Amino acid sequence: MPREIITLQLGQCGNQIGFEFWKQLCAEHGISPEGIVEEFATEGTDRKDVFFYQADDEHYIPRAVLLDLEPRVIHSILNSPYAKLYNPENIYLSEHGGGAGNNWASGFSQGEKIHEDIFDIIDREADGSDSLEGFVLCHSIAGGTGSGLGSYLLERLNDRYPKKLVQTYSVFPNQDEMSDVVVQPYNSLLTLKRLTQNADCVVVLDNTALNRIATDRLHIQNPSFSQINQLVSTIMSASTTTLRYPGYMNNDLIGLIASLIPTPRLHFLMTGYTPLTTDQSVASVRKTTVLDVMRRLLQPKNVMVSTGRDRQTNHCYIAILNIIQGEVDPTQVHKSLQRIRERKLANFIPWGPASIQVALSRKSPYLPSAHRVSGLMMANHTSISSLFERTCRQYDKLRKREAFLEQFRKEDMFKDNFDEMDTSREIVQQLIDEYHAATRPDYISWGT
Amino acid sequence: MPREIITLQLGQCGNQIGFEFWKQLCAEHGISPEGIVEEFATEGTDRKDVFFYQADDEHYIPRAVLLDLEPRVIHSILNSPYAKLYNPENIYLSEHGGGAGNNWASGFSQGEKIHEDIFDIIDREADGSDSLEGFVLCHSIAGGTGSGLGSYLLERLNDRYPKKLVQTYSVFPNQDEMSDVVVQPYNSLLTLKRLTQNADCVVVLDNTALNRIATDRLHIQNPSFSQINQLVSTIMSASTTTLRYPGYMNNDLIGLIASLIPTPRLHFLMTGYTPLTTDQSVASVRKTTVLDVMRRLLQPKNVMVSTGRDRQTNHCYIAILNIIQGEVDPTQVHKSLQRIRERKLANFIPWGPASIQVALSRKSPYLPSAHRVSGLMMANHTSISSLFERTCRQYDKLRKREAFLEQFRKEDMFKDNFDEMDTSREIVQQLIDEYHAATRPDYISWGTQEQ
Amino acid sequence: LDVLNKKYSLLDHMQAMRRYLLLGQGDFIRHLMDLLKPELVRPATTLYQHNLTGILETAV
Amino acid sequence: FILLKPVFHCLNEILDLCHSFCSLVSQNLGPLDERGAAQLSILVKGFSRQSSLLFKILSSVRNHQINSDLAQLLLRLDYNKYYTQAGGTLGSFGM
């Protein structure tokens, strides 16, 4: 049986991302908004059972859980044409609709209040999964609901499913925009704490990176949250195409991700996308070769993660996995790897063997692809520490400023102190330093 | 990777020269005015990556930077058919459009004011270069914008890119025309200072020699700046032919020029072009021989620099490089070199080995050549000091007259003193003396601290 | 002669010999030598043939 | 490489060592006991010797220009030149 994946969409940002993800998945699999495979979707070559459940022999329902502490977003999802696509038994919605008030401590307390309902939903979804690999959580780290509830959910999943894999799609707050959530660094700190202690892999989705890519690369003057969520859903689709089109390699999510995370702490992944085109530049299908593809991918404009320019640390890639979809000549791939090494287009860790992994994947047969060749890059790159260092600096600035802590003190998790945020900030600082070490040859002796 | 060359066009004259150079390069490479390679440009034997970058899968954009202190010329370039050839991020126009007021000090101060933006642009272009050899600056040394901004740019490039080459196309003031710019000798002095201290190679463009050639050889009664710019573009094309026609030897600018500059001080090059013909004389493909080419090149009348007949100094050629384009038989080249040496048609330095270098080149297939054979002469000749001596005399006359110094004293570089001008004069005096010494066998001890 | 040209590209093979084996592609040789300088300066015992072939292909 | 009898045999020995290592790792849920640690050390020594043999084989094939694809695989393995820096031996497992 397929390794089923439960998609959890948490808080306003997480729920928007989940909704757009489900829309993209439905579009890629040719599933009607009711969860029924469209009659044109006769190409049964997609693996829906990894991420979707079959309601009947023909209707695939996403294995997606939409979770919000505010009823407005859940109702808006239920007000879409795709409301019937998801199994309603996998949907847990907080009755109070009041949200967490952008308070991580409130989100955690609400998760505890909905612990029974949430864990009943999780157990019900697990029993509906023949060989469940794990859960995918979509949330924001800056808010209250998606952040606080995300930390609570991660803790309870680790306690309840200690033998199950936990992957997250974690939307990180925009670091270039002034967050109105002054306690977001506290929320971000709690989410990073839970990912460090109870998650095995955290996929960082920086809203700053999404906005930067939409503005500079997509030529979007005012990127909507919806447009960012649709870009994220497209990225997730490209990352899951090899799961939906089974092949010789990377036939499981854990098999795919095992090569990327060498240590439990080294669970910060960078992303890359191909082909990268400006929204206006869709017009010209460039006959890009695997060497040309990799060369465009090696351009920072084509990487699906905007890591800051750390000038002090010689940040390097720890590992790279390229998932390429479409028509690829193997000799061109070989020449691409050869040129990349010869041109030193990527710096790798000096302390161990490192390379750019290349995966070739089929496109979804139910979704017509406008591009002859597409590609995902997954990378572990020390330059992600510059994002992590910036998050740590924001955390320290908030704790030193006690900003918005009075609202967290209203919630029991933060009522007496913000010590969890400070411990999370210290752990994140140690993580940044370790990521800098992993850019260095002394990573061989790191942790000795 | 190719050794990329960034072309910098500075001030009105420099920008006109750069525009015409880019036009000539496009014509030679079969590049459309939009930056697209013409269908006839099927000979992939040219190294565009040295001077051009690909803007798209079809559009090749010259690695050329157009810089002006007046917006009129930049707008006129952007109003030309070649507006789409250049990368728009490589086009810098001064917002004030006011120029430097023919003040070198003002041009330097303006360069300092736009230093951050200009160096950010330069670094952005440099990162687009896989194996950038260096920068080529087109400017005038007599004006304010091309001269002052050129000196500022040279200083900042030497500080920031000390490992990168800095080539200049430097327009030297007309020595036969009375310059209305009384401070031109001051502007020229500051530019020569920067060329001595911060430039590695200065291509001297004497407007007097250009005007003289245009009048006597081009039969132009009133030579326009445009005709001089078209001649300069032809010269640049010939200088880039070895990049555009790759061969066994001299396939790179540094490889080509290494043979030409024996000493760091002996970095003043003279140029020659052949055949010089009016457009009308395209009709008759004359079977010109290499010997005939070299003989015409050896004529001072064919030298693209008008050096006076100095009777007091035994000026001599230090080195000669002939870049010949077209059909050349090597055995004819050998016999020609033998005969040239036998006839002692050129006097060389007595203190070291010297010869006439000869390069044979193919013509551009994308540019229809009206001439079966074309040729560039590059020469190091001690008589170039007489041009420098004349510039020095004009400088000394202005300093002794304090002419136009009030305009320079308005600018910080000359506000308190002219010590930079005096240091330039002293360096130029030492350079002149060395050039006279370099004409003599005692050049072996010339420039030695014991001397 | 026609067979040699059409089937074995004898003249084309000779032109290839001129361009590469006779170092006729001088720019290619220059760039190859520039890349090899850090390699060709190294002790020959440290050379990996795979690396040299990759450098050759990259220069081409 | 099925035809490459010595390379195939070296690879088979490596695969059996890998299987034994995986069995040892699966048997110890916690930190390796003294027996698990001893098995890990023995496997590390065997692997380093086999990887040195593999590197020698790859260099010999390069010297014979026999197979481009084996050179491509070696290049991919030593992409960061770590294995090249490690002399083609599998990196010491840090205990």
JSON list of C-alpha atoms in Angstrom, two decimals, chain A residues 213-292:
[
{"chain": "A", "resi": 213, "resn": "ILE", "atom": "CA", "xyz": [10.63, 35.66, -5.58]},
{"chain": "A", "resi": 214, "resn": "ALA", "atom": "CA", "xyz": [7.19, 36.95, -6.58]},
{"chain": "A", "resi": 215, "resn": "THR", "atom": "CA", "xyz": [8.43, 40.54, -6.87]},
{"chain": "A", "resi": 216, "resn": "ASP", "atom": "CA", "xyz": [11.86, 40.10, -8.46]},
{"chain": "A", "resi": 217, "resn": "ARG", "atom": "CA", "xyz": [11.38, 36.81, -10.34]},
{"chain": "A", "resi": 218, "resn": "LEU", "atom": "CA", "xyz": [7.63, 36.60, -10.97]},
{"chain": "A", "resi": 219, "resn": "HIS", "atom": "CA", "xyz": [7.41, 40.34, -11.76]},
{"chain": "A", "resi": 220, "resn": "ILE", "atom": "CA", "xyz": [4.47, 40.59, -9.35]},
{"chain": "A", "resi": 221, "resn": "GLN", "atom": "CA", "xyz": [4.31, 44.14, -8.03]},
{"chain": "A", "resi": 222, "resn": "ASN", "atom": "CA", "xyz": [1.97, 43.23, -5.15]},
{"chain": "A", "resi": 223, "resn": "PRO", "atom": "CA", "xyz": [2.17, 39.48, -4.45]},
{"chain": "A", "resi": 224, "resn": "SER", "atom": "CA", "xyz": [-1.02, 38.30, -2.81]},
{"chain": "A", "resi": 225, "resn": "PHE", "atom": "CA", "xyz": [-0.90, 35.75, -0.02]},
{"chain": "A", "resi": 226, "resn": "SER", "atom": "CA", "xyz": [-2.96, 33.59, -2.39]},
{"chain": "A", "resi": 227, "resn": "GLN", "atom": "CA", "xyz": [-0.34, 33.92, -5.12]},
{"chain": "A", "resi": 228, "resn": "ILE", "atom": "CA", "xyz": [2.42, 32.93, -2.69]},
{"chain": "A", "resi": 229, "resn": "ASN", "atom": "CA", "xyz": [0.33, 29.97, -1.55]},
{"chain": "A", "resi": 230, "resn": "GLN", "atom": "CA", "xyz": [-0.21, 28.95, -5.19]},
{"chain": "A", "resi": 231, "resn": "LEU", "atom": "CA", "xyz": [3.53, 29.17, -5.83]},
{"chain": "A", "resi": 232, "resn": "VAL", "atom": "CA", "xyz": [4.14, 27.02, -2.75]},
{"chain": "A", "resi": 233, "resn": "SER", "atom": "CA", "xyz": [1.54, 24.52, -3.93]},
{"chain": "A", "resi": 234, "resn": "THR", "atom": "CA", "xyz": [3.23, 24.37, -7.33]},
{"chain": "A", "resi": 235, "resn": "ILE", "atom": "CA", "xyz": [6.56, 23.74, -5.59]},
{"chain": "A", "resi": 236, "resn": "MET", "atom": "CA", "xyz": [5.03, 21.00, -3.45]},
{"chain": "A", "resi": 237, "resn": "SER", "atom": "CA", "xyz": [3.48, 19.44, -6.56]},
{"chain": "A", "resi": 238, "resn": "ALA", "atom": "CA", "xyz": [6.86, 19.41, -8.30]},
{"chain": "A", "resi": 239, "resn": "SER", "atom": "CA", "xyz": [8.42, 17.87, -5.20]},
{"chain": "A", "resi": 240, "resn": "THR", "atom": "CA", "xyz": [5.68, 15.21, -5.08]},
{"chain": "A", "resi": 241, "resn": "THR", "atom": "CA", "xyz": [5.63, 14.36, -8.79]},
{"chain": "A", "resi": 242, "resn": "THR", "atom": "CA", "xyz": [8.19, 11.60, -8.25]},
{"chain": "A", "resi": 243, "resn": "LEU", "atom": "CA", "xyz": [5.93, 10.27, -5.49]},
{"chain": "A", "resi": 244, "resn": "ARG", "atom": "CA", "xyz": [2.91, 10.38, -7.80]},
{"chain": "A", "resi": 245, "resn": "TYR", "atom": "CA", "xyz": [4.86, 8.86, -10.72]},
{"chain": "A", "resi": 246, "resn": "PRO", "atom": "CA", "xyz": [6.56, 5.82, -9.18]},
{"chain": "A", "resi": 247, "resn": "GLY", "atom": "CA", "xyz": [9.96, 4.80, -10.47]},
{"chain": "A", "resi": 248, "resn": "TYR", "atom": "CA", "xyz": [13.23, 3.01, -9.76]},
{"chain": "A", "resi": 249, "resn": "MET", "atom": "CA", "xyz": [14.33, 5.44, -7.05]},
{"chain": "A", "resi": 250, "resn": "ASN", "atom": "CA", "xyz": [12.82, 7.76, -4.46]},
{"chain": "A", "resi": 251, "resn": "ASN", "atom": "CA", "xyz": [9.72, 5.58, -4.30]},
{"chain": "A", "resi": 252, "resn": "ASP", "atom": "CA", "xyz": [9.00, 6.72, -0.74]},
{"chain": "A", "resi": 253, "resn": "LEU", "atom": "CA", "xyz": [9.11, 10.07, 1.02]},
{"chain": "A", "resi": 254, "resn": "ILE", "atom": "CA", "xyz": [11.48, 8.82, 3.72]},
{"chain": "A", "resi": 255, "resn": "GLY", "atom": "CA", "xyz": [13.76, 7.33, 1.07]},
{"chain": "A", "resi": 256, "resn": "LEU", "atom": "CA", "xyz": [13.71, 10.68, -0.71]},
{"chain": "A", "resi": 257, "resn": "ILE", "atom": "CA", "xyz": [14.38, 12.78, 2.40]},
{"chain": "A", "resi": 258, "resn": "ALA", "atom": "CA", "xyz": [16.87, 10.45, 4.13]},
{"chain": "A", "resi": 259, "resn": "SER", "atom": "CA", "xyz": [19.68, 11.56, 1.82]},
{"chain": "A", "resi": 260, "resn": "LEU", "atom": "CA", "xyz": [19.06, 15.24, 2.59]},
{"chain": "A", "resi": 261, "resn": "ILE", "atom": "CA", "xyz": [19.17, 15.25, 6.41]},
{"chain": "A", "resi": 262, "resn": "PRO", "atom": "CA", "xyz": [22.51, 13.84, 7.63]},
{"chain": "A", "resi": 263, "resn": "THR", "atom": "CA", "xyz": [21.96, 14.75, 11.29]},
{"chain": "A", "resi": 264, "resn": "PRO", "atom": "CA", "xyz": [18.77, 15.37, 13.30]},
{"chain": "A", "resi": 265, "resn": "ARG", "atom": "CA", "xyz": [19.82, 18.99, 13.69]},
{"chain": "A", "resi": 266, "resn": "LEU", "atom": "CA", "xyz": [20.73, 19.34, 10.00]},
{"chain": "A", "resi": 267, "resn": "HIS", "atom": "CA", "xyz": [17.06, 19.26, 9.03]},
{"chain": "A", "resi": 268, "resn": "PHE", "atom": "CA", "xyz": [16.98, 22.71, 7.40]},
{"chain": "A", "resi": 269, "resn": "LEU", "atom": "CA", "xyz": [16.38, 22.23, 3.67]},
{"chain": "A", "resi": 270, "resn": "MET", "atom": "CA", "xyz": [16.80, 24.74, 0.87]},
{"chain": "A", "resi": 271, "resn": "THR", "atom": "CA", "xyz": [14.71, 24.54, -2.27]},
{"chain": "A", "resi": 272, "resn": "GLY", "atom": "CA", "xyz": [15.20, 25.15, -5.96]},
{"chain": "A", "resi": 273, "resn": "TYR", "atom": "CA", "xyz": [12.76, 25.13, -8.83]},
{"chain": "A", "resi": 274, "resn": "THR", "atom": "CA", "xyz": [13.05, 24.59, -12.57]},
{"chain": "A", "resi": 275, "resn": "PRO", "atom": "CA", "xyz": [12.30, 25.73, -15.09]},
{"chain": "A", "resi": 276, "resn": "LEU", "atom": "CA", "xyz": [12.36, 29.18, -13.50]},
{"chain": "A", "resi": 277, "resn": "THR", "atom": "CA", "xyz": [10.53, 31.73, -15.62]},
{"chain": "A", "resi": 278, "resn": "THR", "atom": "CA", "xyz": [9.21, 35.19, -14.96]},
{"chain": "A", "resi": 279, "resn": "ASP", "atom": "CA", "xyz": [5.43, 35.33, -15.12]},
{"chain": "A", "resi": 280, "resn": "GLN", "atom": "CA", "xyz": [5.86, 37.36, -18.29]},
{"chain": "A", "resi": 281, "resn": "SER", "atom": "CA", "xyz": [8.59, 35.00, -19.54]},
{"chain": "A", "resi": 282, "resn": "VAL", "atom": "CA", "xyz": [6.42, 31.88, -19.81]},
{"chain": "A", "resi": 283, "resn": "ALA", "atom": "CA", "xyz": [6.19, 32.59, -23.54]},
{"chain": "A", "resi": 284, "resn": "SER", "atom": "CA", "xyz": [9.60, 31.39, -24.75]},
{"chain": "A", "resi": 285, "resn": "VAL", "atom": "CA", "xyz": [10.08, 27.66, -24.26]},
{"chain": "A", "resi": 286, "resn": "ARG", "atom": "CA", "xyz": [13.88, 27.62, -24.22]},
{"chain": "A", "resi": 287, "resn": "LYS", "atom": "CA", "xyz": [15.30, 24.27, -25.34]},
{"chain": "A", "resi": 288, "resn": "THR", "atom": "CA", "xyz": [17.25, 24.09, -22.09]},
{"chain": "A", "resi": 289, "resn": "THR", "atom": "CA", "xyz": [19.66, 21.19, -21.72]},
{"chain": "A", "resi": 290, "resn": "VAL", "atom": "CA", "xyz": [20.36, 19.45, -18.43]},
{"chain": "A", "resi": 291, "resn": "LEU", "atom": "CA", "xyz": [23.60, 21.43, -18.37]},
{"chain": "A", "resi": 292, "resn": "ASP", "atom": "CA", "xyz": [21.63, 24.58, -19.24]}
]
